[PDB]
């Protein structure tokens, strides 16, 4: 006889975040031997060693913002790579770093990362000290004899620090010419040597504008194919492309598989949703305000050829109207609006 007032609050977010700001941390310790997700600062387990605590502290702060999520896993050094791969498969991550990654370990990590990106369609990134690999998803930071705060630092320590800093770097900002106040003492290098090192695809520190900053933010991949172009030599472009890929895949898996059927109206609704997501991206400065979403018409041609239906004696619109057999083919025109790190103007 009693119906009561039961009210539950609702919050709406204009911006939806997925698989961003994630830091994957794996360290070899014989005491903790477990996974620890750190969401609050100054959260230090007593099991971890002093060097591991220094790694955590380096990962704590960022250039602009603290990294959103810090995930740490601990296991013995023996058979560390297998368990690290299994755990990273279990839980998604954005960036990866290893304090004691040997060249074989780095090569195995890169191979696993590229295999994921090429087969599993999982866009992941890794930061490594000295890797000459032929992929842009990995990050190679070849800067030796680095000292921060009059303290000697290994290469992997500063790679982890830079990965944490990049995790806090906003997309509007560029990692190029970002100064580090903590870094005070570095071996003297010439401008020509630094330029040659950067042209090799390496990330290094330079003393410019009265501060110690990184010279560029290019990818570790030295050889970009003809299609990839100059923009694919930048981590900034691939970052937003990977984010868009992950968001589209996530929404597709959430909505369209199983729950939604295949129909012309369903295709129109999917196109409208894709256009809305692209407009949301256009709200940010990441991509250009102009983009188009279209049905892949030649893919429909190929599907008809597989079916064997003659292309003559019907309207070309009937190709779109024709059922694709539980399939959808789409075409989209996009362009990355990542702005300018350097300028060169003229006077009169």
């Amino acid at each position: 006889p009693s119906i009561n007032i039961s009210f539950k609050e609702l919050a709406t977010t204009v911006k939806e975040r997925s698989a961003r700001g994630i830091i994957a941390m794996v360290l070899k310790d014989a005491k903790a031997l477990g996974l620890n997700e750190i969401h609050e600062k100054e959260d230090i387990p007593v099991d971890l060693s002093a060097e591991n605590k220094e790694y955590i502290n380096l990962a704590l702060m960022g250039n602009v913002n603290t990294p959103n999520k810090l995930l740490v896993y601990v296991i013995e050094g023996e058979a560390d790579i297998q368990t690290a791969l299994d755990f990273l498969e279990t839980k998604e991550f954005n960036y990866l770093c290893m304090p004691k990654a040997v060249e074989a370990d780095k090569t195995a990590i890169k191979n696993w990362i590229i295999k994921l990106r090429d087969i599993d369609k999982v866009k992941v990134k890794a930061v490594l000290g000295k890797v000459v690999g032929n992929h842009e998803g990995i990050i190679n930071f070849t800067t030796e004899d680095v000292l921060v705060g009059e303290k000697k630092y290994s290469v992997d320590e500063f790679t982890s620090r830079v990965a944490g800093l990049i995790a806090g770097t906003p997309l509007s900002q560029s990692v190029t010419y970002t100064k580090l106040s903590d870094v005070v003492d570095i071996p003297k290098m010439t401008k020509v040597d630094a330029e040659s090192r950067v042209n090799k695809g390496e990330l290094i520190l330079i003393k410019e504008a009265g501060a110690i900053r990184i010279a560029r933010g290019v990818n570790s991949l030295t050889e970009l194919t003809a299609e990839k172009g100059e923009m694919f030599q930048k981590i900034k472009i691939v970052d937003t492309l990977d984010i868009i890929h992950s968001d589209i895949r996530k929404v597709i898996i959430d909505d369209y598989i199983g729950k939604v059927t295949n129909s012309y109206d369903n295709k129109c609704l999917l196109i409208v949703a894709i256009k809305s997501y692209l407009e949301e991206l256009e709200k940010s400065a990441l991509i250009e305000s102009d983009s188009t979403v279209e049905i892949d018409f030649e893919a429909q041609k190929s599907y008809l050829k597989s079916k064997g239906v003659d292309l003559s004696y019907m309207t070309l619109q009937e190709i779109k109207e024709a059922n694709t057999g539980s399939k959808v083919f789409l075409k989209a025109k996009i362009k990355v609006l990542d702005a300018m790190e350097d300028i060169d103007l003229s006077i009169e």
């Binding site: 509007s172 900002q173 560029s174 190029t176 010419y177 970002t178 504008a209 009265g210 100059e230 923009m231 400065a285 990542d338 702005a339 300018m340 790190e341 350097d342 300028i343 060169d344 103007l345 003229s346 006077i347 009169e348």
Partner: protein, 120 residues
């Protein structure tokens, strides 16, 4: 009632702006007169910021290098850089006014056209 006294010709060393190294004519630095000194002064002012070097006076310097490194989008930083150039160049008594036409967006290299008005 008395008319304004004309600014005497600014004389100093000369060099190729592309070379960025001082040049010597038979041991004598090339003489700069009329529209030769102001280009050197503008090049020196724009090239280096004052806040990096403690020796220079506070009024000297430009903040265009802050925009270096892609700290903000191009749409408003175009006008911001125009204003920065105007602030950095009108400090010279010789220069009357500075005009900026537009900016060209292509790849990562930005090209802009800026105008200088002089007395001689």
């Amino acid at each position: 009632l008395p008319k304004t006294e004309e600014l005497p010709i600014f004389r100093e060393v000369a060099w190729d702006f592309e070379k960025d190294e001082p040049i010597l004519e038979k041991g004598d630095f090339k003489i700069i007169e009329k529209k030769e000194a102001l280009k050197v002064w503008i090049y020196k002012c724009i090239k280096t910021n004052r806040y990096e070097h403690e020796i220079y006076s506070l009024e000297y310097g430009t903040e265009l290098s802050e925009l270096i490194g892609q700290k903000y989008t191009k749409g408003l930083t175009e006008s911001e850089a125009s204003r920065f150039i105007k602030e950095a160049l009108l400090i010279n008594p010789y220069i009357l006014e500075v005009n900026v036409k537009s900016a060209n967006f292509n790849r990562d290299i930005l090209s802009a056209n800026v105008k200088v008005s002089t007395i001689y």
